[PDB]
Design a protein around this ligand. Structure first.
Ligand code: MN
Length: 429
């Protein structure tokens, strides 16, 4: 199918095949000089330069170096600047250039390439789809929307365009309108639609409009390998870790941490309330995307295993207490923080980013009624001086319908089945 040879190229198929085969063999440094010399021999050889680029491209993957890759990105460009270039080759060259530009984070550079391709091939639908992604990657949702509307006006059933259009609509706070576009695009089974991100947004949208069918799509996502289960849907995971929504302190093995929290809870409470009264500005609003309504703030002591020195000066005894338990102060994928929630608050269902942590909640100030938290299929309430433990990689949801504020202390710990070496090796989240 691919037509990569023009008349001038058709006279050197033997030389090219050899040079090409060397790359295929894995002996790359030969293919470089091999193709490099094919330029000096015949400078107007797109396929020769295209080879050199692929060599540099493959050589980049080999050496894990961005510098040589930057070279390839230019060589792919050179291919497109030659007098007579076969269309198929021109498309392959600039597409790979755009892809590698995106890889390095040259998003606007990639966009310019994509804009060039669309100008060269004004009838290729897939290229317009790629142009749309280009706009999305620089945060230009308005131009991306126009692209996919253009596509859909010509190809109404293009699935790739539907899921992206749906995503754009959702981002513009047109939640209900986004759902059918996301549904139809996924059901089309078109290339690029079987992506966990679209299951994520589809399920999220449905839940925010009160459609209980969301879990059917989460389950399907699980079947497609996008989610660990219908409930457990975190992105950054380690395999083999025991997965259950609620834990008892004994099951975690962190019994001494739990005892220390429950026994000195009044102390932890009082330093939190003091910050409220004297430095309320230290309580920052929580995730706006997760808050449907109400007032919900947080005061952080540890973040990604990093102590906040200024914050500990406001709660010196609590920090001193926590220093003794590295399973939480060293948890690079968790936090330690006060969390205050006022009446009329609702937190949308959601999961945390990883399955490598458990989340402890110590009740500090709990109204008599109105406050509750669901994880998976079980709903519970807090108790002053008592610790709850759940795996927040499982879907959880929170309500505050009391007559006074709710204060809790949040303590993340390494998943207990993680080995010391794993706890040392994992990147931070
Ligand atoms: Mn949460």
């Amino acid at each position: 199918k691919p037509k990569l040879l023009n008349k001038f190229d058709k006279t050197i198929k033997a030389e090219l095949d050899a040079a090409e085969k060397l790359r295929k063999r894995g002996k790359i440094e030969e293919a470089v000089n091999a193709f490099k010399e094919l330029v000096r021999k015949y400078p107007q050889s797109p396929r020769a330069r295209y080879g050199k680029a692929q060599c540099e491209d493959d050589l980049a993957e080999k050496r894990r170096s961005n510098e040589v890759l930057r070279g390839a990105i230019e060589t792919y460009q050179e291919v497109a600047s030659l007098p007579d270039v076969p269309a198929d080759l021109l498309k392959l060259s600039l597409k790979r250039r755009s892809d590698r530009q995106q890889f390095l984070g040259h998003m606007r550079g990639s966009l310019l390439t994509l804009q060039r391709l669309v100008q060269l091939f004004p009838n290729d639908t897939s290229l317009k789809n790629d142009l749309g992604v280009g706009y999305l990657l620089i945060g230009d949702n308005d131009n991306a929307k126009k692209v996919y509307e253009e596509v859909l006006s010509v190809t109404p059933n293009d699935g790739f365009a539907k899921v992206h259009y749906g995503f754009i609509l959702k981002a513009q706070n047109k939640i209900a309108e986004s759902i059918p576009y996301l549904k139809e695009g996924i059901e089309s089974g078109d290339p690029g639609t079987d992506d966990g991100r679209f299951y994520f947004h589809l399920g999220d949208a449905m839940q925010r409009v009160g459609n209980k069918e969301a879990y059917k799509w989460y389950e399907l996502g699980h079947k497609r390998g996008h989610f660990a289960s219908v409930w457990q849907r975190s992105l950054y995971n380690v395999n083999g870790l025991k997965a259950q929504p609620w834990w008892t302190p004994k099951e975690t093995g962190y019994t001494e941490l739990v005892k220390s929290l429950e026994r000195n809870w009044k102390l932890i409470r009082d330093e939190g309330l003091a910050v409220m009264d004297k430095a309320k500005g230290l309580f920052l609003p929580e995730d706006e995307n997760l808050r449907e309504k109400g007032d919900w703030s947080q005061f952080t002591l540890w973040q990604q295993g990093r102590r906040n020195e200024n914050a500990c000066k406001g709660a010196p005894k609590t920090c001193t207490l926590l220093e003794k338990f590295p399973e939480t102060t060293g948890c690079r994928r968790g936090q330690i923080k006060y969390s205050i929630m006022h009446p009329g608050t609702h937190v949308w269902p959601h999961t945390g980013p990883t399955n490598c942590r458990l989340r402890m909640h110590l009740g500090l100030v709990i109204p008599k009624e109105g406050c509750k938290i669901r994880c998976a299929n079980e709903t519970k309430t807090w108790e002053e001086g008592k610790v709850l433990i759940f795996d927040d990689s499982f879907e959880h949801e929170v309500w505050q319908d009391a007559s006074s504020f709710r204060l809790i202390f949040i303590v993340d710990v390494w998943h207990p089945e993680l080995t010391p070496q794993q706890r040392r090796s994992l990147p931070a989240i």
